[PDB]
Amino acid sequence: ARKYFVAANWKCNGTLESIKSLTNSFNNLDFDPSKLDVVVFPVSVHYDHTRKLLQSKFSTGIQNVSKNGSCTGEVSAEIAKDLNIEYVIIGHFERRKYFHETDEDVREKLQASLKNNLKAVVCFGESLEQREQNKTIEVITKQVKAFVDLIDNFDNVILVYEPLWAIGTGKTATPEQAQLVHKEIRKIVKDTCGEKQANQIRILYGGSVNTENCSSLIQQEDIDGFLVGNASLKESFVDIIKSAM
Amino acid sequence: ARKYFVAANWKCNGTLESIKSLTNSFNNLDFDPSKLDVVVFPVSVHYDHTRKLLQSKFSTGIQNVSKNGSCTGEVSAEIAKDLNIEYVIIGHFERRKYFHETDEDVREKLQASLKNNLKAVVCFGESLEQREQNKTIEVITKQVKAFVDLIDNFDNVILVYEPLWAIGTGKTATPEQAQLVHKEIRKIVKDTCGEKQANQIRILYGGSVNTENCSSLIQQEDIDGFLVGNASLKESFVDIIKSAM
């Protein structure tokens, strides 16, 4: 084999100058984009500036795509394709939390994205309550089955397990916690899509990944990379990319 | 005086090519930006392309700004200022409708925008039920008082009356319907902010403005321009600008 995948998620963050020096530091890292996918997801209005500054070895995407007639104010899949935006994030915590986004919404967003030839980074994960109450696999299973059957090309949809309690909190899942879930996610894909598809699909962990914990996470057999928020705002993010090289 | 103000609102609409030919047609119109404000509000990811293509006589803005710690995925006022985005829209129908945005949210967005030296286009209006049930002035009054006291510079906040039943529907308010409301809105500003401030502030109508109805709307004493959705997607939008010249 699987090609590893490391994503930066710049959430509501950045100035033109901070992006300039950050992208400069990222550009200083030699890696081979045929061997490793590295994707940056800036704020919408930072997209063009970020794409201008990042060297071609980096891919770029946007943090959301819309599902109509009544304009919700979100960027459509059609608009993203026309702009040659390669990737979209779907199902990220803030969409589900603050904007009532359902599993059915995730399904339709995935449909719209693939219809429009976008690659999708699809996120899911359980709350702290749901884990404490032994419901994590139940939760993940329903979340993943909400959309996984739509997948056509298993290089073009990337799954991200991000338990809600690890996102932005500093409280990273242990490697074994993450691996346990990734094993089960890959089984759901095997049972629904096929053995070859499951062995091909990338399943990433996100939730307070940093330079100290990334090596032990990526070492796990079914963890294929990361979605990285807070630590991707730092120049040391290049060391997290290195852990997947 | 009062300087007139005509705004284009491109809601979830456009390709790079359609923006290219549309902006070209807009650029062909001679007007004096010291005498007339003309502002285009593109989709977020179209902002830089649209700003590149539009001549300096046109101002530009974005369709929303965020109110935290937990990133909602919206563009912040700080980010907009850093990008030298001149204007923001606040309280537009789709924010209130599809995203539960309250009068209190509008107030805080206006606060954040002014704190960050943004000019604000603040929208409000009653539903069809509320009008049919004789509640329009009541509704408008509460909406406007939710924020109007925060206004400091009365060139820099622009009020937009857009009755919800006229937005995107083809069902334009008559000039007298609109004027009745604008008179009352200007009185609210007089009573809360002062006689000079009220005579200075721009109060625009929006809701299916087009080339056939704009002249009779703008002719009304307290209507100072327009927020234009559907008709601003056409090259004939230049004739709506002309009606305010």
Instruction: Check: CB of residue A161 under 8 Å from CB of residue A181.
Output: yes
* Number of neighbours of residue B60 by Cβ within 10 angstroms: 18
Q: Which residue has the tokens 């986004």?
A: A101
Instruction: Check: CB of residue A88 under 8 Å from CB of residue A118.
Output: yes
Q: Is A127 on the interface with B (CB under 8 A)?
A: no
Q: Which residues of B touch A168 (CB under 8 A)?
A: 70
Half-sphere exposure of B203 (CA within 13 A, CB side): 28
Number of domains in chain B: 1
User: B3, B58, B47, B48: which is closest to B25 by C-alpha?
Assistant: B58
Q: Which residue has the tokens 């007139």?
A: B4
**Distance (Å, whole) CA B178 – CA A39:** 49
Q: Is A169 on the interface with B (CB under 8 A)?
A: no
Contact criterion met (CB < 8 Å) for A83 and B11: no
Contact criterion met (CB < 8 Å) for A75 and B44: yes
Instruction: Check: CB of residue A9 under 8 Å from CB of residue A229.
Output: yes
Backbone torsions φ then ψ of B25, nearest 5 degrees: -65, -40
Experimental method: X-ray
Q: Is A94 on the interface with B (CB under 8 A)?
A: yes
User: B100, B115, B17, B113: which is closest to B62 by C-alpha?
Assistant: B113
Quick one: how far is CA A87 from the chain centroid? 9
- Give the single-character DSSP code of B58: S
Q: Which residues of A touch B77 (CB under 8 A)?
A: none
**Distance (Å, whole) CA A227 – CA A121:** 9
Rounded (5°) CA angle A3-A51-A214: 40
* Separation in Å, CA A244 to CA A7, A233, B82: 11, 18, 34
Half-sphere exposure of A241 (CA within 13 A, CB side): 25
Q: Specify the pairing of strand B157-161 against strand A36-41.
A: unpaired
Q: Is A233 on the interface with B (CB under 8 A)?
A: no
Contact criterion met (CB < 8 Å) for A73 and B95: yes
Q: Is A64 on the interface with B (CB under 8 A)?
A: yes
Q: Is A227 annotated as a binding residue?
A: yes
Q: Is B207 on the interface with A (CB under 8 A)?
A: no
Q: Which of B48, B64, B72 is facing A98, going by the closest CB pair? A: B72
Q: Which residues of A touch B168 (CB under 8 A)?
A: 70
> Catalytic residue positions of B?
92, 162
For testing contact with chain B, the best of A15, A41, A45 (most B CBs within 10 A)? A45
* Number of neighbours of residue A124 by Cβ within 10 angstroms: 27
Closest chain A residue to the Cα of B101, Cα to Cα: A99
Domain containing A7: what range?
Answer: 1-245
Contact criterion met (CB < 8 Å) for A73 and B11: yes
Instruction: Check: CB of residue A160 under 8 Å from CB of residue A121.
Output: yes
Q: Which residues of A touch B63 (CB under 8 A)?
A: 73
Instruction: Extract the runs of DSSP E, i.e. beta strands, from B10-168.
Output: 36-41, 59-62, 87-90, 119-124, 157-161
**CATH code: domain of residue A123:** 3.20.20.70
Q: Is B11 annotated as a binding residue?
A: yes
Q: In what helix (H) or strand (E) does residue A122 lie, and over which residues does it extend?
A: strand A119-124
User: B17, B74, B65: which is closest to B41 by C-alpha?
Assistant: B65
Distance from CA of A204 to the nearest CA of B (A): 21
The 3 state secondary structure assigned to A21-76 is HHHHHHHCCCCCCCCEEEEEECCHHHHHHHHHHCCCCCEEEECCCCCCCCCCCCCC
Q: Is B181 on the interface with A (CB under 8 A)?
A: no
**Exposure pattern of A159-181 as b/e (b: 16+ CB <10 Å)?**
bbbbbbbbbbeeebbebebbbbb
**Distance (Å, whole) CA B202 – CA B157:** 8
Residue A130 in tokens? 């749901």
Q: Is A11 annotated as a binding residue?
A: yes
User: B221, B199, B156, B153: which is closest to B2 by C-alpha?
Assistant: B199
A46 is catalytic: no
* Number of neighbours of residue A232 by Cβ within 10 angstroms: 25
Q: Which residue has the tokens 């704009």?
A: B214
- Would you say the C-alpha torsion B175, B177, B183, B185 has a positive or negative sign? negative
